[PDB]
Amino acid sequence: EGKIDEAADILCELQVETYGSMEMSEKIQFILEQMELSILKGDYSQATVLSRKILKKTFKNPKYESLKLEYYNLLVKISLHKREYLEVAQYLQEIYQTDAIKSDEAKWKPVLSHIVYFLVLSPYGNLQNDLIHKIQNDNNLKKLESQESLVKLFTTNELMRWPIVQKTYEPVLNEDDLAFGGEANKHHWEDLQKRVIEHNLRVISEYYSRITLLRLNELLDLTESQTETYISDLVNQGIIYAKVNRPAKIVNFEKPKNSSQLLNEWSHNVDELLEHIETIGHLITKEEIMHGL
Amino acid sequence: MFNNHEIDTILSTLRMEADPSLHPLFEQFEKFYEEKLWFQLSESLTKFFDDAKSTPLRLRLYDNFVSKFYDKINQLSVVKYLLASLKDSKDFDESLKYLDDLKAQFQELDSKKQRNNGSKDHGDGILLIDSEIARTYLLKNDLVKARDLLDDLEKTLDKKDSIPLRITNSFYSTNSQYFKFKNDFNSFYYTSLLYLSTLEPSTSITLAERQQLAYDLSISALLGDKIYNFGELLHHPIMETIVNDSNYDWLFQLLNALTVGDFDKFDSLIKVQISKIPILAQHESFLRQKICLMTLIETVFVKNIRMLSFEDISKATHLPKDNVEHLVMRAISLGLLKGSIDQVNELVTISWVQPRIISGDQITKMKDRLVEWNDQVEKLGKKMEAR
């Protein structure tokens, strides 16, 4: 009828009274109905409280694969208003185990794929590694092989990569409704873009000691105004630092800048000369004997 | 010719008296299969020179001679030959049928006597099934099925002492085949090198096997690299009496091609289609940087210092100004470098740390460097000594 508030009011009183008794299945069911109504109102915070309670409930229960899936469907929706890839990623990780023992590869492979791909939008690549390393995630599965190749591609990125990625894949770039609530096609573009832009700076710092800004604006393929901003936000967060020398249009990534490094680097250098002298000493002595022979 | 009946029968008699062991329908039957200049057996020690050299429909008869062979000779010979002979003979359907026959038992338990692996020695009963199920299954069927067979082949390698070596042979040949089966000429180049390395110094070889390995190495070495594209194949047997067949001219053609960097030369290196792969389409840039890097590394400063002109890297590699920018960009990613090239200052200032090619101009360079390292030390010493 459209009386959202009225249906919720009656559902809220019911579930609370029932709690702690009258079947584990029955109680979890009311909570799914409730979150569905809650999300439309704006009641994301009420939805988070409901989420804590159900999460304990699904754990208690043995034989609860249906219950866990149902919780997942509710959980992703609330994260869509907020924006955490960590919430969705973690509870799905606990669903991985349950999907190997109980279910077919038909249930398991769309979930695995969605989870990694969720992490691809996610702007920091440091989660991504963890999920990819996985023993049955590095062997076989077509989608598995597509994600791992992307994982190598980021390492090497010089950000002429992104349109290559954008065109080449279209499933595994727009695929939803298979272990997640979905997300706009247009939202996938937004996220992917930010993630690459950051990762180009991130590699660029290691590989090259200096780059000029004119070259860098061309590499990202981007306007200076934006580049200055993408860089500015990153350095400020302190995942990395870089420094700009504005009248030169040169970006320093810096280099060693302290005595403490240099003393230890020196004592290393000695340590390598020494080791060479002993390896050379025994090695040469050996050479000699077999000249003899 | 008489030589199969002659050699088998006399040696068969010599190493046990007669007792159901002579076999005149064996003697005639093998006689029928191979009386050319190749023979189907040559008994006992002779089984290390003649054993099946054509499709061996004598097989059911030989199962009753495996059931005599142990007391006509030894341990090793039985496990050594009869699995490989079907495989070389291209008797794939037949190989499977014999693996059902043998399965895992040929004298185990309180028969005692230490067990090795097949295709060299008397094996692991289980290890024959495991190794050859992978060898056969790969040829037949898909890559996803292959990854799964390799994981089992890996379990069996791990689960043993390394002592008979035969099992390790099984691992390299098995594993090499997956990289052939896909596209992975670089991964295959590493695996083929290992396969040859633990094949040659212990013998046990077969003209069929060394034909695959030398030709397979030649295709893989063009098809992918990481170290350098031909210096390593001059400390790296490509035709040093492994076999010279199948036009090993290509190796020498490659070094000339690598230096000039002509497209015409790339087609005339091997033959058109097999030069391209499609492997070489990604490959030419990687291969390209390899020739440039080595040539400069020896030449520019006798000491070896990490100073290069950007210009002289372009001039030497023979590529345009943007292109080299992209190629170097990939090259730092690949490592064996680090220390931090400044892409403004036009200073290729990356640290010295890579391996140096061959025993030739390594030695020239070492003498110069030695006189200098020594001289430096001697000055310090002298001054200290005096006061």
Of A140, A203, A209, the CB nearest to B342: A209
Give me the residues paired with residue A251 across strands.
Answer: A211, A244
Residues of B in contact with A253 (CB under 8 A): 340
CA distance B302 to B111: 67
CA distance B94 to B57: 9
Name the 3-class secondary structure at A77. helix
B290: its two tokens = 């390899």
- Residue A209 is classified by DSSP as E
Instruction: Tell me how crowded residue B321 is: count the other CB atoms within 10 A of its CB.
Output: 9
**Best of A209, A211, A220, A284 to mutate (most B CBs within 10 Å, chain B):** A209
Q: How many CB pairs under 8 A join A and B?
A: 39
B307: its two tokens = 């100073």
**Best of B332, B340, B370 to mutate (most A CBs within 10 Å, chain A):** B340
CA distance A129 to B267: 41
B47: its two tokens = 């089984």
Residue B230: phi, psi to the nearest 5? Answer: -160, -15
- Residue B35 is classified by DSSP as B
Cβ contact (<8 Å) for A211 and B341? no
Burial label, B142 (beta-carbon count in 10 A; 0-12, 13-18, 19+): exposed
Name the 3-class secondary structure at A208. strand
| DSSP letter for each residue of B294-341 | HHHHHHS-SS--S-EEHHHHHHHHT--HHHHHHHHHHHHHT-S--S-E
A21: contact with B, CB 8 A cutoff: no
- How open is the CA angle B78-B115-B213, to the nearest 5 degrees? 65
Cβ contact (<8 Å) for B343 and A210? yes
Entry resolution in angstroms?
9.3
Residue with the two structure tokens 């062991």:
B21
CA distance B49 to A284: 43
Q: At what angle do helices A44-60 and A24-41 cross, to 10 degrees?
A: 160
B182: its two tokens = 């896909």
> Domain map of chain B by residue range?
6-387
- Residue B359 is classified by DSSP as S
CA distance B10 to B27: 10
A211: contact with B, CB 8 A cutoff: yes
Report yes or no: B317 and B292 within 8 Å, Cβ to Cβ: yes
- Residue A173 is classified by DSSP as S
Smallest CA-to-CA distance from B52 within B100, B26, B88, B27 is with B88
CA distance A48 to A72: 13
Any residues with CB less than 8 A from the CB of A123 and at least 6 apart, and which?
A191, A194, A195, A198
Smallest CA-to-CA distance from B208 within B38, B9, B356, B63 is with B38
Cβ contact (<8 Å) for A139 and B333? no
Give me the residues paired with residue B346 across strands.
Answer: none
Dihedral sign for Cα A246, A248, A251, A256, please: negative
What residue of A is the nearest CA neighbor of B326? A158
CA distance B347 to B328: 13
Smallest CA-to-CA distance from A159 within A194, A192, A197, A207 is with A197
Of A203, A208, A255, the CB nearest to B343: A208
Residues of B in contact with A139 (CB under 8 A): 147, 151
CA distance B139 to B346: 52
Q: What is the 3-state secondary structure (H, E, C) of A149-185?
A: HHHHHHHHCCCCCHHHHHHHCECECCCCCCCCCCCCH
Of A203, A209, A211, the CB nearest to B349: A209
Smallest CA-to-CA distance from A126 within A232, A198, A183 is with A198
- Residue B223 is classified by DSSP as H
Name the 3-class secondary structure at B7. helix
Q: Name the experiment that determined this structure.
A: cryo-EM
Instruction: Tell me how crowded residue B31 is: count the other CB atoms within 10 A of its CB.
Output: 22
How far does A212 lie from chain B, in Å, by closest CA?
A: 6
CA distance A178 to B24: 71
Cβ contact (<8 Å) for B332 and A212? no
Report yes or no: B311 and B269 within 8 Å, Cβ to Cβ: no
Report yes or no: A123 and A195 within 8 Å, Cβ to Cβ: yes
B366: contact with A, CB 8 A cutoff: no
Any residues with CB less than 8 A from the CB of A18 and at least 6 apart, and which?
A26, A27, A30
Of B148, B151, B330, the CB nearest to A156: B330
Smallest CA-to-CA distance from B30 within B8, B49, B46 is with B8
Strand B341-343 and strand A208-212: pairing?
A: parallel
B375: its two tokens = 């001289």
